[PDB]
Design a protein around this ligand. Structure first.
Ligand SMILES: Nc1ncnc2c1ncn2[C@@H]1O[C@H](COP(=O)(O)OP(=O)(O)O)[C@@H](O)[C@H]1O
Ligand SMILES: [Mg+2]
Lengths: 578, 471, 155
């Protein structure tokens, strides 16, 4: 392998000379401390290296050693219930090797080499093996971790280990060609894991929020983006999705954000309950943490590590949800490196290849048939942080052209404490028409008609607001004041949801369907009452408004009685007017 | 080592930069001493090193330097500060030298000024409520111990007075939390960057009158001092604060006077080095550089100490979308925004409640901490004030005589809110009095319109008349 | 056939190859590395000392020691035939439907010559698109260029 010496140090960039024979994007060891680096440019006898650690204190002339391999991650049992940094090092053991601060040069293994796992073989000697097939089953936190053949390994089984307890380094299956198969394998983070066939999306990804589940749905293998200014609700929404969604495994990527947000997840998740298994919530969650004051070059590595782990859990037949806390910091890191490369920038200083990276990251999602014949899915939700809320940013515009759903947030709604503050006018979803056969069978036969009626009412209310600004609310006729007040009721009851309330934080589909039915029944009765001769000032003082307006806080187990009482109360109240 | 080595052969001096050719022995980020031909010594730091030449930024001005006699000598490889427990009650300049006439401190440790990132595993959630004595902060934008809560100001707004009042009145309430302990006052670390004499004298006189100088460490960089020294001051101030809090269990409150001057000082160096700019000419790495300062606060698991930050910054032409407030809002955990309109009406403190935010409010309030009705009252106040402000815009079109009876209630609520809740003067309200005033203000609205408050609290606190408090 | 091995610079999507003055501007080349993988590329500048090549795909496995460049074709050409009706292509002429490749009747440059303005004639016949709002009020005539303006969430 190639060795060289440091020629120039400038911030996060190091130029080494004598590096003839090195390859692009290989992992290097820089200096006497052995900092981790990566080659990004070759020029004659010199190579350009970006360092994933702080470079203060380095001197010119220190040796540089090239490993000859790209960045890779260890994939195997023991990844659940843990927290990793940008290059997959466990923080809980850095916490033991070092004090409360993170220092340089710490070498830890991603998977614990001491813990023993109960191995149960499923293949026999003489069997033909192939990439993506299962070799055995190991229990892990109530799941069944399946040992997988690496995607490009073929051969015939010579011998297998009997049932027992082994570490991850123990070779369990030996092939006839002399290659030993362990309980884990390594995979480059920049290569997408191959599959058999992609499938269409026909199953919704339930989030627990009324406005996102009803008005702007996202499918099981779909993608979504949630942009907004600072203080609009991106992090709270993503953490609520991590808490309440129906995904089997949740992967969270903290790319360049606050550390208190990761501390909250580390503290509160072990006390919560997994909705579909009943165990601790943290047992299904994997965290990748790279906070703001961490080294800049590790932000891209965290994103790639997260997506690679999410694809690894896809190959075992699970449905995985991946959350990216901010994809804008990745672009900022790319711009910072591009400054040190002295290359020609794009519209706002970003490198020209930013859109290619963004497209390659998002197209890794989808519902597939795995190499073993099973079915899995990965869904990606990525947040965008525009500068000053300017939605004409290049990153925001690039993301708009590849995602299937768009959840735009508004600062004006967040100012008046109206949450989740989703801008109804600027948001859309492209999975609405494909999920109707699921909704009809699993919720109700007339649910899409109710959803379309609600959308039509919102559109009509949005149409009338140009006149209200012009001549005031009182100039409208009563038939239009009814539309305005019904729109206000919908906005303050159905769309609004409190993520910190004890009951309102989670909402099933049938509860939202009942609320929509109640609102539409009230609107129909009020529309019938106006033409009979009742002034609108009589209608909007009926006590059934408080019955409707507080149906949010009714618990899930108590809702069917409340709904049946309110539907009778509507008819009882509207027959006594005139 | 103990030897010294001098490098001659300076080939370029212009602005804040200086080039030396045969200095390949210098480590990256090291601190050097630049000696003039007349014997004057100036400081510097290496920002780029190579086998061809090294680049050094100069803290002081470059007047009097020449290429024939100037020499550069190494001081140390990594910038370090000598700290001790005995610097409480001392004053230092922008680069750590005493300016009070007392002899220099004797270090117990030498710590790197750049610091290290806190391990997210070793952190813990901040949950201790702090009573500042301001109703618009205590009730609706609650501040907890370990939080970063900057203040967004203007050119003529009294942000310094608000910061001094907060530092004077801040206390915790162990009786509400049931601990029964009696606490000790906060230690104050004060970092001034480009401060003027008019504000520095006010701060000095306020600290003298309150008697808090014996617990304070001061880092002063005046407006006539060299600009490039502003790079170092926040780092040394936070190094001292972290040392005190996490080695001697102090509760440290840190005030940074103006981050706008720090950003201009950073932009000067960024433009001198031909970096790729962001918006409005600021360098592209300003987010990371601001993050290395702010995220040094918080609490640590298994330790009694804490660090609380109150940065102050001025918004250019009151613009919230300027890059400095934009990135500060993206990094910090909330903000307190002053309003010029409230200042023109004579309301003090002129805190605008709608653009203000506190992210850690949910951790430090609720049952068993302050009171069971805190959050719902805050939400109802926010909604009602927003409705009143919205009605104020309809009045400008249709006239206030054409309003309905319902909207006049919201308009009068907004006026009474601005004239009574926000406007408090120099008095020190407790949390209970602030909640009493808030409940007295909510009583002017119909009982059926309090949608965000449960009926249990409404049946317990509603009905109190505002004249019973101010009459 | 001939291979150029004088690579001197790799950075992002570009690479420099020396002594390559025989390559025409805009030609298509194949980039081969030590692992045997072959990538595509296009020449974007030719000079006396070196030529500049923009690389398709990614440049992860490349190195200055074993990389070689060979010529494919001087002008980007496409083989056309009437067998193409019912086929799918990936955007550069490679089938992706699994059927065998077509046999070309001709090979034409993908960049087209301009039409002589004295050779055109006025469009005079319509196309039935089956949509009432297009057929009746905004009729499409044979030889017209009629774009459709849409938003983001529109179908
Ligand atoms: N669904 C919600 N329910 C209640 N409060 C919310 C909701 N969403 C956001 N908030 C409030 O808005 C603030 C937004 O903070 P956060 O989402 O952490 O920052 P950002 O959106 O800028 O990343 C939070 O402090 C939270 O109190
Ligand atoms: Mg956030």
């Amino acid at each position: 392998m190639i060795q060289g010496v440091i020629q120039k140090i400038a911030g996060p960039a190091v130029i080494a000379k004598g590096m003839l024979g090195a390859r692009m994007y290989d992992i290097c060891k820089v200096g006497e401390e052995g900092l981790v680096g990566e080659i990004i440019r070759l020029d004659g006898d010199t190579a350009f290296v970006q360092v994933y650690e702080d470079t203060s204190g380095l001197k010119v002339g220190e040796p540089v050693v090239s490993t000859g391999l790209p960045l890779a991650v260890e994939l195997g049992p023991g990844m659940l219930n843990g927290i990793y940094d940008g290059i997959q090092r466990p923080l809980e053991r850095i916490r033991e090797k070092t004090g409360i601060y993170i220092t340089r040069g710490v070498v830890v293994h991603a998977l614990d080499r001491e813990k023993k796992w109960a191995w149960t073989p499923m293949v026999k000697p003489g069997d033909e093996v192939r990439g993506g097939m299962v070799l055995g089953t190991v229990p892990e936190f109530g799941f069944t971790h399946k040992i997988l053949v690496p995607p490009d390994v073929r051969g015939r089984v010579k011998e297998v280990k009997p049932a027992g307890e082994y570490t991850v380094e123990e070779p369990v299956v030996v092939l006839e060609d002399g290659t030993e198969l362990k309980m884990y394998h390594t995979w480059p983070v920049r290569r997408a894991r191959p599959v058999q066939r992609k499938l269409d999306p026909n199953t919704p990804f339930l989030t627990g929020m009324r406005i996102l589940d009803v008005l702007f749905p996202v499918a099981m293998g779909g993608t979504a983006a949630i942009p907004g200014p600072f203080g609009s609700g991106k992090t709270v929404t993503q953490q609520s999705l991590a808490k309440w969604s129906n995904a089997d495994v949740v992967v969270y990527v903290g790319c360049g954000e606050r550390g208190n947000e990761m501390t909250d997840v580390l503290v509160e998740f072990p006390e919560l309950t997994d909705p579909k298994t009943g165990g601790p919530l943290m047992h299904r969650t994997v965290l990748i943490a790279n906070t703001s004051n961490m080294p800049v070059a590790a932000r891209e590595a965290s994103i790639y590590v997260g997506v690679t782990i999410a694809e690894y859990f896809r190959d075992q037949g699970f449905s995985v949800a991946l959350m990216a806390d901010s994809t804008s910091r990745w672009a900022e890191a790319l711009r910072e490196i591009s400054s040190r490369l002295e290359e020609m920038p794009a519209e706002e200083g970003y490198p020209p290849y930013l859109a290619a990276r963004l497209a390659a990251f998002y197209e890794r999602a989808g519902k597939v048939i795995t190499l073993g014949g099973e079915e899995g899915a990965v869904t990606i939700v990525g947040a965008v942080s525009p500068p000053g809320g300017d939605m004409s940013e290049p990153v925001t515009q690039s993301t708009l052209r590849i995602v299937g759903a768009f959840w735009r947030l508004d600062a004006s709604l967040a100012f008046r404490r109206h949450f989740p503050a989703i801008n109804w006018n600027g948001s859309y979803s492209l999975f609405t028409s494909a999920l109707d056969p699921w909704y009809r069978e699993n919720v109700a036969e007339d649910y899409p008609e109710l959803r379309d009626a609600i959308s039509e009412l919102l559109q009509r209310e949005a149409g009338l607001q140009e006149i209200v600004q012009l001549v005031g609310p009182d100039a409208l006729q009563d038939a239009e004041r009814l539309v305005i007040e019904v729109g206000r009721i919908i906005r303050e009851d159905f769309l609004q949801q409190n993520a910190y309330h004890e009951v309102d934080a989670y909402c099933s589909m049938k509860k939202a369907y009942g609320i929509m039915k109640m609102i539409l029944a009230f609107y129909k009765e009020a529309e019938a009452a106006i033409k009979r001769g009742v002034s609108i000032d009589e209608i909007l003082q009926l006590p059934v408004l408080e019955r409707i307006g507080r149906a949010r806080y009714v618990s899930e187990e108590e809702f069917p009685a409340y709904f049946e009482e309110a539907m009778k109360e509507i008819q009882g109240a509207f027959k006594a007017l005139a | 080592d103990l030897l010294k080595k001098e490098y001659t052969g300076i080939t370029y001096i212009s602005g804040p930069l200086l080039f030396v050719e045969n200095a390949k022995d210098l480590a990256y980020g090291a601190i050097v001493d630049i000696k003039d031909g007349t014997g004057r010594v100036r400081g510097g730091q290496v920002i780029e090193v190579s086998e061809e030449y090294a680049v050094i930024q100069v803290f002081e001005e470059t007047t009097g330097l020449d290429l024939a006699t100037t020499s550069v000598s190494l001081v140390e490889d990594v910038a370090r500060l000598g700290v001790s427990k005995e610097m409480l009650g001392r004053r230092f300049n922008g680069i750590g030298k005493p300016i009070d006439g007392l002899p220099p401190i004797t270090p117990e440790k030498r710590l790197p000024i750049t610091g290290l990132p806190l391990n997210p595993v070793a952190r813990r959630k901040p949950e201790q409520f702090i009573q500042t004595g301001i109703s618009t902060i205590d009730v609706m934008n609650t501040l907890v111990r370990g939080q970063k809560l900057p203040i967004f100001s203007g050119s003529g707004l009294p942000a310094n007075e608000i910061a001094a009042q907060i530092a004077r009145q801040a206390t915790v309430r162990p009786d509400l939390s049931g601990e029964g302990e009696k606490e000790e006052p906060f230690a104050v670390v004060f970092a001034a960057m480009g401060i003027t004499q008019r504000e520095l004298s006010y701060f000095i006189q306020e600290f003298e009158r309150t008697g808090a100088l014996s617990r304070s460490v001061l880092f002063l960089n005046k407006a006539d001092d060299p600009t490039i020294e502003r790079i170092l001051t926040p780092r040394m101030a936070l190094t001292v604060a972290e040392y005190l809090a996490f080695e001697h269990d102090y509760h440290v409150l840190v005030i940074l006077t103006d981050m706008t001057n720090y950003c201009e000082a950073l932009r000067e160096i960024g433009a001198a080095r031909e970096e790729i700019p962001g918006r409005r000419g600021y360098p592209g790495y300003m987010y990371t550089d601001l993050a290395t300062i702010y995220e040094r606060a918080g609490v640590v698991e298994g330790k009694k100490g804490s660090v609380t930050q109150i940065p102050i910054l001025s918004m250019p032409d009151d613009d919230r979308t300027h890059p400095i407030p934009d990135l500060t809002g993206y990094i910090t955990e909330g903000q307190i925004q002053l309003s010029r309109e409230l200042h023109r009406k004579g309301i003090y403190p002129p805190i605008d409640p709608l653009p203000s935010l506190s992210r850690l409010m949910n951790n430090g309030v609720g049952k068993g901490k302050t009171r069971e009705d805190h959050k719902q009252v805050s939400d109802q106040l926010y909604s009602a004030y927003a409705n009143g402000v919205d009605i104020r815009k309809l009045v400008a079109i249709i006239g206030e005589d054409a309003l309905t009876e319902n909207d006049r209630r919201y308009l009068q609520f907004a006026d009474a809110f601005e004239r009574f809740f926000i406007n408090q003067g120099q008095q020190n309200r407790s949390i209970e009095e602030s909640l009493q005033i808030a409940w007295a203000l909510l009583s002017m609205l119909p009982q059926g319109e309090l949608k965000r408050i449960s009926k249990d609290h409404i049946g317990k606190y509603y009905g109190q008349k505002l004249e019973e408090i101010w009459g």
